[PDB]
């Protein structure tokens, strides 16, 4: 089956996370763009990295993603289904 | 489990919004970004969250009220499974 | 009800549009421009959180509307929506 | 000469704007964006923001059709113009 | 009577310090800010934050000092002045 | 100094950036997209200020990488402060 993963990370690790999937191979699978986000308020410009992978590619790209950039979260989320078109 | 809530709404509710978030203490996991829509060319404001399955009624009360007006299209709320959150 | 994405070619924009207007599937849909990579490239994202029974024909709509002529177009995926509240 | 007419507009001016320039005949010349804007902790507010270069002629003409289409009020927008040394056109 | 155009493009992570410096300042309601994509060297790519402010000639140098000690570490960015011929409000 | 702005087919990003890359001026770059209408359009737009001396050469470098048989702006600018 395949999963959606998304990442919002600190902007400033655009960079790291650019360069850590091109080594892993996965660049050409992922979207990215910039959101706003709060802390505390507090404004805070995000990027919002976007990917669909395989099942078993998931934890791999967790790992892959939490090692490049770490502010952030990653979520995990079901697709019924992909067409390449 | 945990539950990702989307929102389309209009453009000029994003204060409201923000406003009613900071208030009910969810502010810090709210993403926006503006989107076109169509009724018609709309620029809209798009609202992402993910939350606890149990916050989800809270939450979708919470945007309805802070952002309605009495619909000539106010926007959509949707609700979505999550598998699994990480925090880096 | 399903959520329906799509990453397509900018250039595209157009005739997904035209297409979804005649199909009275416009008013679902909103768009995004996002950045991908094949090299870095503009892309368009579309959503639309669509009846079930209209997911085959819309899934249909959106490949047509953009096929590349050739290589890597994009990707359009299917994902479950829990429920949708109009807002009031 | 030429000169850049900028406006920041209420979002939910946009498709007034463009009908308008579509009736003007300059549609083609816009170019529109969103950006985040502020108002009187910060209020934050979602604005469309709006880009045509024009000849020296047509600006009166352009902040007319803009400020028509737009207005309500209390937004309602701000427009700008600026000076532009040259327009490259690419083919 | 000048009207100026100043743009800054900034490092994302002093978008608040940014905000809140021209909150006190009372500036802040003429600033729009967007999200773009900007390039470094090892090239690298990086989030930015373009700033977009019209201001009155006189304020110019106070809005410069402002976004200047809002967004500096060493280095941040850059700001440019622009004329403006005039003004509109709708 | 000139600000060039560039509004660009969407398909001709890369084209561009590594032209950029190649010239030694893609640090001082910014890209954004936009709409445009011909009709819609997704458009990539490019930001750059530059020395007087340097237009020339980018609108070259810009014309030359973007074009297959969009537009160009060149504006003033009264000062640059780097942070």
């Given at each position: 089956?395949?999963?959606?993963?998304?990442?919002?990370?600190?902007?400033?690790?655009?960079?790291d996370l650019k360069?850590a999937l091109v080594?892993?191979?996965?660049?050409?699978?992922?979207?990215?763009?910039?959101?706003?986000?709060?802390?505390?308020?507090?404004?805070?410009?995000?990027?919002?990295?976007?990917?669909?992978?395989?099942?078993?590619?998931?934890?791999?790209?967790?790992?892959?993603?939490?090692?490049?950039?770490?502010?952030?979260?990653?979520?995990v989320s079901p697709?019924?289904?992909?067409?390449?078109?």
């Amino acid at each position: 089956s395949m999963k959606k993963i998304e990442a919002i990370i600190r902007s400033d690790k655009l960079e790291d996370l650019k360069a850590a999937l091109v080594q892993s191979g996965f660049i050409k699978g992922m979207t990215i763009s910039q959101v706003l986000g709060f802390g505390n308020p507090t404004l805070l410009a995000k990027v919002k990295v976007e990917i669909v992978a395989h099942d078993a590619a998931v934890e791999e790209m967790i790992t892959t993603i939490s090692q490049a950039v770490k502010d952030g979260k990653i979520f995990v989320s079901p697709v019924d289904e992909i067409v390449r078109i």
